[PDB]
């Protein structure tokens, strides 16, 4: 159940990427409350991995 919390961290941390498309209601500060300090170390890296992902978006080929 340990990774059950961990996997949710990646979910919330992905909301920061939607900032590049703020055409819809997206509370970027909501993730700051949903993500406790107990996972700040993981969230820190999550931001790096996600901020680089929004650059390429998806890209299948």
């Amino acid at each position: 159940q340990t990774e059950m919390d961990k996997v949710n961290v990646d979910l919330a941390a992905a909301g920061v990427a939607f900032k590049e498309r703020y055409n819809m209601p997206v509370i970027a500060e909501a993730v700051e409350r949903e993500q406790p300090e107990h996972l700040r170390s993981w969230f820190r890296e999550r931001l790096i991995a996600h901020r680089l992902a929004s650059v390429n978006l998806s890209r299948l080929p």
Partner: protein
């Protein structure tokens, strides 16, 4: 063994095939044996292969960048198939989920027959509609009705709905 499922997708189509042009992003299923939770829950994430629908995003918050490293339906095709093959599929508005499931199955081009041929598809909405005719029978509606909390749950996503649906299912058939 009873299987409760809730499949989150990249939005739905209002016209024509509600699954055409869309993909599955999250699969959440819970296992119920002897009216008790065994803990054998199946929670996996899939590839969107496209952009998440604006409406779906506001529903429970899901970003495309989150389903990037996650595997696709092709990586868990047999895995999920064996998990539900020859079992009872309790879903809310089965026409939605099953439609997407079979859709993805055909995309694999493995001659895989419709899920309804190897699994007993039973809709919980139909049951609720018979019990409460003309009343709101949504998951949140039934949740509040049977005094079940779906807000203070750690499980986020399809797994959340699946868990709730399981409780509702057992409550109605209790």
């Amino acid at each position: 063994r009873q299987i409760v499922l809730d499949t989150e997708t990249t939005g739905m189509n209002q016209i024509g095939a509600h699954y055409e042009g869309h993909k599955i992003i999250e699969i959440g299923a819970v296992e119920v044996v002897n009216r008790r939770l065994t803990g054998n829950n199946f929670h996996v994430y899939l590839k969107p292969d496209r952009l998440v629908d604006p409406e779906a995003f506001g529903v429970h918050g899901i970003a495309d960048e989150f389903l990037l490293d996650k595997p696709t339906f092709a990586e868990v095709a047999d895995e999920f198939m064996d998990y539900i093959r020859g079992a009872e599929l309790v879903i809310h508005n089965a026409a939605f989920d099953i439609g997407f499931m079979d859709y993805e199955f055909s995309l694999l081009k493995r001659d895989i027959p419709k899920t309804n041929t190897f699994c007993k598809v039973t809709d919980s909405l139909a049951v609720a509609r018979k019990m409460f005719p003309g009343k709101r029978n949504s998951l949140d509606a039934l949740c509040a009705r049977y005094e079940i909390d779906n807000s203070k749950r750690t499980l986020h996503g399809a797994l959340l709905d699946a868990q709730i649906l399981a409780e509702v299912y057992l409550a109605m058939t209790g």
